[PDB]
User: Which sequence fits this backbone?
């Protein structure tokens, strides 16, 4: 038995007498709370055991279930330099010294064959009389042989004359522009850029505002000021957006225009839409109004491109298998490519050269190019390809075009004529889109939604930029130097409806269905249509709000720290 | 023919002769530029057409291809009232005002089986003699026809006596409570809630700061202010987050603690991690430091729940097919349910009642309840279920439990004992998780990535809250009233290691792989481990920046307008 101050629970466990009937089941057999004193409340009041309340006793045995359990009824009524060597050896073009008896023995001994790069003989001959431009080398047998200083090599048709190597013959020599010199070279930066030299090597750097990355996410377009590593709101409350492209400040406003497609869902067709994007840090939650261009019968716009010098918008519909061109306001639709297309994935245009490029991801993947007016169609790659999701053009390096591939998991480039095919990125974890800017190749891993960065030449290591939802569909660099804004428009106001580009000059065209009248080739039978302008957007600087007056003209206020009509002055 | 000053294209098109040699291929043919004399540069300085530059003749024909073409080396040197009854009508059951002649003709004319009430024949009677309780009508040949006064129903035996209704029983009568009274009812808001009336009717507004939403994605966890509509950063850079739960403000320091499970990635085990959350508004100014509990052999913790009273954490694992418990610092792991489990998906705990609930979404789905100590396991719902991926408990409405399906995509509610199953929400677009707060019920449509909302009783209609991502795995409401903080811990420090809870009391238990000391039920032969303390948090408020010194303690770079060790003084 337990002590006087302890209570024997039924199982034998001794419980301190204080814990008995304290309101908690304190031992396994639950007998520390069994046989507790009844709940006395007061005279004249019936306590229902299920609540603990004390209802009047006049409510007992009246056939009304007054308490939750009704006890009133049922209960009561119940690296060193190149090593020198003696004259019995020779310093080859390669960084080594090889014995002179291995020279003019007619067997390669220092890799570059420099030991027998044109050995010469002659009874009248001496090495140091006149044989080649820079240096010759003599051996005691009477033979003699020449070599050329770095940056030079003996001529192929005459092994006694030094000729310069054009260092631009190699892909990865300089950023931007390689320029050849006799025995040397230079890597001067193009206008707008600046020279810089970083840990991995020389680097050409842009100017002005830092680049932005525009990221469509099937519901929103989100900005990323890459030098601040912060996001900004921009467009929202949209659905099934698939690809975007922009035109840089067409009206000299400080407000570029972003063109984005919308996929068709169910029985509602898709459309291409346009809206202003602030070139200014005003990434605040300012109102953004999109405008539909009104292009009908769109079922899957998969690729989109903007000709900023011709003021045309090019796109391709994978389901309908057409590549179409129209003005930026959606007028004068025109079918360019209508045959031999199974699934046109993405397109890009080069108005400087008048060439447009596109990819096919259907049964027989291929990459094709043609004139921007639809003529001179040709192929570029037809082997070792699958699902070429997208391509972009590096206008600053001989207009070489890179493209992505999510079946070979590769990124590789080619010149605009189809030559110089090189592999750039391997193991790119399903790249779905890409863009090239200032050497940095950006691409999107669709299976996991990361933005990845590497040098466009592919001679560095990968870097992860940021991670977003798998709704990410494309990466696009939003910067002034992305497109040469100063490219002159060759059109001479001769065409009536459309003035497409071709390599040099231009070419007139009619809207789809209408033809030229009597072979005029400038005048079409279709009636001309008025241009479509966009409503004035909010241009407020330094993070001001935006309102609409009684005239619904967007006028906007801000903090008085900055003043002006548009919050532009300090 | 063409004019004198107009050049002729060979197709019959006449164009101004100024376009000759202007630079662009104007004609449809190329003759507009073909035949143009090239620009003259200088004598003795050859202009290479491939670049547009002029080069001295000494550099020319040196076998160095100075220009890209290299031709310099080859060719250069070649109701108001609801129709109330008068004396001429009959009330029938509760207002069916047809003419009076339905009185006790022994025919069910009213349609409702209340046309004849009383109706005991005999001409010499009036119930004013106290034959029926209240509100008779005079029977023409039987004295009394006695329908019950409003708020009452007739008893089976002695139908002349009317039983009071129980209006608290009917589902969805008041948002929070009820008080059955004599022929009437009164309903009120429980402690912590303020009475308000919307355009529809009653609302019990929770006091204090407005509720938040916590959205865990595979990469990050995002806060949301249901009243301000602005997001917040919280935890970032993490990977493979599945489900979360929190413990409100344990130390009164002003910071709750958020627990979240991390899946197994590749061939590497997952973990359960915890971190502070600022109850006060803050973001990007306090770095968030997560810590690991240290639970090995963990693959897929789809279910996590925090018992705020006993200070235990309950989680399930789909791969191990078992449910385990441990302290909030990862000590003393113990298995609770180990048999007849296919895929334990979600879990919830009710310390006040002493019951914890889990859902199984295997080949034979079921929803079960058991004591926290692990006994009295039973099946609540097995009929008509498919993939019950979610689970929530409404601690206010008689501890009712809700769950979300994914095959039948309904949301249902049932009492904790398993009776009165109701289908609260239909066609819920495959909900994945639940959380019931105040008046409304929240759930996540997984594929669409949208957070939705409805009145928790199923009345009215749905409403989109916000859209995140296809990565959204849960929604959990964050507020101090979500878990009643004033529930007293029944444990009395007599148990070493785990002190589990049960209906009405506690129970001591030993960690896994160890037993009690023989002859004892409060002590085990295993050792004990010291509690694992939290690292000090960044408590900065109002935008103050946290900072780490040589001591690595968090301190504040407090913002303007506020003073104090962090920012606590206005
Ligand atoms: C992305 O993030 C990066 C890093 O955070 C940002 O740098 C970048 O844009 C930055 O945006 C701010 C605000 O618009 C710019 O501030 C302005 O800079 C002007 C020029 O500053 C000069 O000197 C700095 C020295 O470091 C040099 O870096 C700059 O390149 C430049 O040579 C500055 O003059 C200007 O104030 C003038 O204009 C006001 C207009 O009202 C007047 O009131 C005021 O009196 C004065 O005359 C302002 O401070 C910032 O320059 C810019 N980036 C940089 C550093 O150049 C972010 N981009 C986006 C899209 O957000
Ligand atoms: C989620 O969204 C809600 C609503 O926006 C936020 O709630 C706000 O929280 C801030 C910070 O706590 C509140 O700001 C402070 O309010 C105090 C008074 O509160 C009452 O009056 C305000 C008037 O604006 C009401 O909005 C509020 O609801 C109460 O009725 C002020 O006294 C504070 O300033 C004064 O005290 C400080 C003390 O240091 C001094 O320094 C100041 O000089 C001054 O004397 C301050 O203004 C704000 O009021 C809250 N608004 C509402 C509507 O709730 C949540 O903060 C947000 N997220 C969460 C949960 O953090
Ligand atoms: C973006 O495009 C512009 C053209 O809008 C490029 O500027 C012109 O580029 C051409 C071809 O490289 C140069 O010849 C131009 O320089 C001058 O050209 C005239 C003949 O028109 C010569 O007589 C001059 O000696 C001089 O060479 C150059 N300038 C213009 C406005 O015509 C520009 O290079 C390009 N920039 C980038 C960043 O791509
Ligand atoms: C959160 O839990 C606490 C309990 O931990 C709840 O407080 C409780 O409120 C009820 C009703 O006011 C109290 O019941 C009353 O008890 C007294 C005797 O103490 C009795 O005379 C009354 O007739 C009535 O039964 C209860 O004592 C009280 N508990 C404590 C310790 O304060 C609180 O309501 C809960 N909140 C929510 C929203 O669930
Ligand atoms: C070879 O050419 C170099 C210049 O690179 C010159 O300086 C050196 O003297 C030459 N060597 C001989 C052996 O002529
Ligand atoms: C009978 O019911 C009416 C309301 O319909 C009420 O006004 C009247 O007082 C009741 N009569 C009695 C006797 O209770
Ligand atoms: Ca007790
Ligand atoms: Ca009663
Ligand atoms: Ca040799
Ligand atoms: Ca050279
Ligand atoms: Ca011309
Ligand atoms: Ca030459
Ligand atoms: Ca009748
Ligand atoms: Ca009642």
Assistant:
């Amino acid at each position: 038995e337990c002590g006087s101050g302890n209570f024997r629970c039924d199982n034998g466990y001794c419980i301190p007498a204080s814990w008995r009937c304290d309101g908690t089941r304190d031992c396994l057999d639950d007998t520390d709370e069994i046989g507790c004193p009844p709940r006395s409340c007061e005279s004249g009041l019936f306590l229902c055991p299920a609540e603990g309340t004390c209802i009047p006793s006049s409510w007992v045995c009246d056939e009304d279930k007054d308490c939750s359990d009704g006890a009133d009824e049922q209960q009561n009524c119940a690296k060193p330099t190149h090593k020198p060597c003696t004259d019995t050896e020779y310093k080859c073009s390669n960084g080594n010294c090889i014995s002179q008896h291995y020279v003019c023995d007619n067997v390669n001994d220092c890799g570059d064959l420099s030991d027998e790069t044109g050995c010469n003989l002659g009874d009248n001959r001496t090495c140091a009389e006149n044989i080649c431009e820079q240096n010759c080398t003599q051996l005691s047998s009477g033979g003699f042989i020449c070599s050329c200083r770095p940056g030079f090599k003996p001529s192929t048709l005459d092994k006694n004359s030094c000729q310069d190597i054009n260092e631009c013959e190699e892909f990865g020599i300089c950023p931007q522009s390689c320029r050849n010199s006799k025995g040397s070279y230079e890597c001067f930066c193009v206008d707008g850029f600046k020279s810089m030299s970083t840990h991995y090597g020389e680097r050409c750097a842009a100017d002005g505002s830092p680049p932005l990355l525009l990221l469509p996410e099937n519901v929103r377009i989100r900005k990323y000021n890459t030098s601040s590593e912060k996001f900004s709101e921009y467009l929202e409350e949209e659905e099934h957006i698939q690809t975007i492209d922009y035109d840089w400040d067409p009206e000299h406003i400080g407000l570029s225009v972003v063109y984005y497609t919308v996929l068709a869902q169910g029985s509602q067709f898709g459309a291409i839409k346009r809206a202003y994007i602030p070139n200014f840090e005003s990434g605040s939650n300012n109102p953004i109004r999109e405008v539909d261009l009104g292009l009908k019968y769109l079922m899957q716009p998969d690729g989109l491109a903007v000709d900023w010098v011709g003021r045309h918008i090019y796109w391709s519909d994978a389901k309908s298998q057409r590549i179409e061109v129209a003005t930026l306001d959606g007028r004068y639709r025109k079918w360019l490519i209508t045959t031999q297309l199974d699934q046109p994935a993405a397109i890009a245009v080069n108005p400087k050269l008048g060439l447009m490029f596109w990819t096919d991801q259907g049964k027989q993947p291929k990459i094709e190019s043609a004139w921007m007016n639809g003529e001179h169609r040709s192929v570029l790659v037809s082997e070792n390809l699958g699902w070429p999701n997208g391509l972009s053009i590096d206008y600053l390096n001989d207009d070489r075009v890179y493209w992505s591939d999510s079946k070979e998991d590769v990124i590789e480039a080619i010149k605009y004529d189809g030559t110089d095919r090189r592999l750039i990125i391997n193991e790119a974890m399903k790249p779905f889109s890409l863009d090239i800017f200032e050497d940095k190749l950006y691409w999107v891993a669709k299976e996991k939604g990361e933005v990845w960065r590497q040098n466009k030449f592919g001679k560095e290591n990968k870097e992860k930029v940021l991670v977003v939802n798998p709704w990410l569909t494309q990466v696009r660099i939003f910067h002034q130097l992305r497109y040469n804004q100063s490219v002159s428009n060759p059109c001479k106001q001769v065409c009536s409806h459309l003035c497409l580009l071709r390599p040099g000059g231009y070419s007139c065209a009619c809207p789809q269905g209408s033809d030229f009248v009597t072979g005029s080739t400038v005048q079409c039978d279709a009636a001309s249509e008025l241009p479509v302008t966009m409503p004035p957007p909010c241009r407020c600087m330094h993070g001001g709000n935006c309102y609409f007056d009684e005239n619904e003209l967007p006028k906007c206020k801000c903090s008085s720290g900055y003043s002006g009509e548009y919050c532009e002055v300090g």
The pocket of calcium ion (ligand 13) is lined by residues B 102, 105, 107, 109, 115-116 (CB under 6 Å). Chain B touches chain A at residues 11-13, 19, 24-26, 28, 32-33, 59, 62-66, 68, 155, 161, 163-164, 166, 180, 182, 217, 219, 449, 467-471, 490, 492, 502-507, 521 (CB under 8 Å). The CA atoms of residues 429 and 489 of chain B lie 40 Å apart.
